[PDB]
């Protein structure tokens, strides 16, 4: 009734079927998936090709979607290999795969265009006129959630500054062991926020609440008039459990309508923005969010473009029809 498909159970897989829905919804990625370079792949061995044969599948298929191929391909195959792991090193791996297969193409650079952050980490000494200013890039943010009661909160403690002394003291090379202050500082947010909750250390229940709608230009060392930070709520990935017995879901409102949809497994149903937001905050039952994702409302309409059909190149189509075939026998 959704008009979206689901992901089959197929092992202790856990975050990878929440992941592989919110990818697939991020349609700027989709496109580009689609037009890597994967006619001469090995259909085992092929990661990228792999990514794509689920995002056709979820695309055109009303039977619910195997990702047996995917997880051979990347080396996943053991009992608890995705266990030893989390959704951010699947993540990392995942598009560090279709961002290599996108060099030289056309649509080279979409990982970066999409996920990078512009970052400054600075070591400014106190008694000492030495500062040491580091320009980073970040894919994604840390953000931890013991102590803080929401988003603002956990952004406020990131921007905080630490304090180096007496054990913990800075060497300024020249000048020695000083006491200094080390922060971090926000330059640009990238178009798709990945917002990664430090419940995972153990696990932590404690209530913790996001906004629909996140202003961060009151985070940034310079804002834009014509282009404001604010962030519109796409998908909310969550966890059931304590320790033990980990149950995986995502929310997504695929549109960025405010129109929500719960994506367990293989069912899909229709839901309320409470069931998406609000009842995955924990706290008190034992169920909450763990992983989040924000659109630039600037952004909104370029990343969520519509996909179609024809954005899915013949050669893709022929090669995937093929092996349906094979496997129809
Ligand atoms: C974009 C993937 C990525 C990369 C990464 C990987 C491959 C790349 N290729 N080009 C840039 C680039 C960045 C580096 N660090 C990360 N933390 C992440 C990441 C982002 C979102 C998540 O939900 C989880 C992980």
């Known amino acids: 009734h959704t008009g979206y498909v689901g992901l089959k159970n197929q092992g202790?897989?856990?975050?990878?079927?929440?992941?592989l829905q919110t990818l697939?919804?991020?349609?700027?990625?989709?496109?580009?998936?689609?037009?890597?370079?994967?006619?001469?792949?090995?259909?085992?061995?092929?990661?990228?090709?792999?990514?794509?044969?689920?995002?056709?599948?979820?695309?055109?298929?009303?039977?619910?979607?195997?990702?047996?191929?995917?997880?051979?391909?990347?080396?996943?195959?053991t009992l608890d290999s995705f266990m030893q792991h989390d959704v951010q090193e699947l993540c990392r791996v995942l598009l560090d795969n279709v961002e290599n297969k996108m060099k030289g193409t056309c649509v080279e650079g979409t990982i970066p265009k999409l996920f990078r952050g512009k970052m400054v980490s600075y070591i400014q000494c106190k008694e000492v006129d030495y500062r040491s200013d580091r320009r980073e890039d970040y894919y994604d943010i840390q953000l931890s959630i013991k102590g803080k009661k929401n988003i603002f909160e956990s952004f406020v403690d990131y921007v905080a500054v630490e304090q180096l002394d007496g054990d913990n003291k800075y060497d300024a090379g020249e000048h020695g062991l000083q006491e200094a202050e080390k922060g971090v500082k926000f330059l640009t947010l990238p178009p798709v926020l990945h917002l990664q909750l430090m419940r995972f250390m153990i696990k932590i229940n404690d209530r913790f609440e996001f906004p629909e709608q996140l202003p961060l230009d009151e985070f940034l060392q310079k804002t834009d008039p014509k282009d404001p930070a604010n962030y519109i709520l796409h998908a909310v990935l969550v966890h059931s459990g304590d320790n033990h017995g980990g149950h995986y879901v995502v929310y997504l409102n695929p549109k960025g309508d405010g129109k929500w949809c719960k994506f367990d497994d293989d069912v899909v149903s229709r839901c309320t923005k409470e069931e998406a937001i609000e009842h995955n905050y924990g706290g008190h039952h034992c169920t909450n969010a763990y992983m989040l994702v924000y659109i630039r409302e600037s952004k909104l309409s370029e990343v969520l473009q519509a996909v179609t059909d024809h954005d899915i190149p013949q050669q893709l189509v022929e090669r995937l029809q093929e092996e349906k075939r094979i496997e129809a026998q």
């Open 12 to 19: 202790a897989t856990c975050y990878m079927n929440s992941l």
């Open 24 to 77: 697939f919804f991020t349609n700027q990625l989709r496109k580009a998936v689609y037009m890597m370079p994967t006619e001469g792949d090995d259909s085992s061995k092929s990661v990228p090709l792999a990514l794509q044969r689920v995002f056709y599948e979820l695309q055109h298929s009303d039977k619910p979607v195997g990702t047996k191929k995917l997880t051979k391909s990347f080396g996943w195959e």
